């Protein structure tokens, strides 16, 4: 298939891997920090989803250095993946408009 769809699919699979690894790594980093809430895997996975999407309900967040570094990777993976799907949609439309126009 075309590159842009393959990159999107790949980005999605990769995003999902980062969400899972990120939930797990966040708990490892945050336990040991008094006051931390990002300490059980189920809510950490939810946290990873809210981080990759930038939804920002604000109910959970890292307080340690490594928990924050993990958070940054999840954000960037999420922003990039959704940015890449947009770029893929644009490429699709540009090609179609070319066809609809006789080129």
């Amino acid at each position, epitope marked *: 298939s075309a590159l842009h769809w393959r990159a999107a699919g790949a980005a999605t699979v990769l995003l999902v891997i980062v969400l899972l690894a990120g939930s797990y790594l966040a708990v*490892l980093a945050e*336990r*040991g920090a*008094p006051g*931390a*809430q990002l*300490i059980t*895997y189920p809510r950490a996975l939810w946290w990873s989803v809210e981080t990759a999407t930038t939804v920002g309900y604000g109910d959970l967040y890292p307080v340690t250095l490594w928990g924050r570094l993990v958070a940054v990777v999840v954000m960037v993976a999420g922003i990039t993946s959704f940015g890449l799907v947009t770029a893929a949609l644009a490429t699709w439309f540009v090609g179609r408009e070319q066809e609809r126009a006789g080129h």
Partner: antibody
Amino acid sequence: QVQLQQPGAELVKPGASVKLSCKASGYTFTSDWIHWVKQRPGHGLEWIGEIIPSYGRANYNEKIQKKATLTADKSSSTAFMQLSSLTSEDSAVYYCARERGDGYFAVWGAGTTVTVSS
Amino acid sequence: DILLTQSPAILSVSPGERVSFSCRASQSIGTDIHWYQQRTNGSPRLLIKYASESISGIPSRFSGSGSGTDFTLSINSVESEDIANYYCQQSNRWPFTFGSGTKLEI
């Protein structure tokens, strides 16, 4: 069948150290945490610390004098707690418990009675 | 760290009566409270998780409720085997902590 196996007792001379063990069977995941809880006679349960065997990381009750050091041997599925320089205050039953990373202690060991005496 | 207060320390009830144990947290912890039962010389046994969720193997008589800072563990129709110490434990913030325990007397 018994999920968590602990020795019945350990006698320790004042000033000496002892290594308690907690052998796990049943389902085992890379995400399990093994906790240790202390209970002095007539008293409640006091959380001592925790360890995730798959990684080797340990956390401790910071609020109490640190008497313990946690380690784990992945090949024998055993978690250990090194108690050092003990006094009669350290005499108590020490439980190990398994937590699936979701906050509660699903199953507990029978406990090891530690007596600090000469 | 979160202080879990269990008062009264001893609860006396008559046979077959509904009984309620109280557990109060120093700050809001959602429903991240779990209950354990510990009979004389036995090890703790999980009774209720996340305030009101059932554990397989535990009698229907046991139930839990509450959210925020105030929690309750109830037993419909107390019977002799229920004589024990009851503890609450929170997992909302690190480190996990235990309540001071309530002993049930019939």
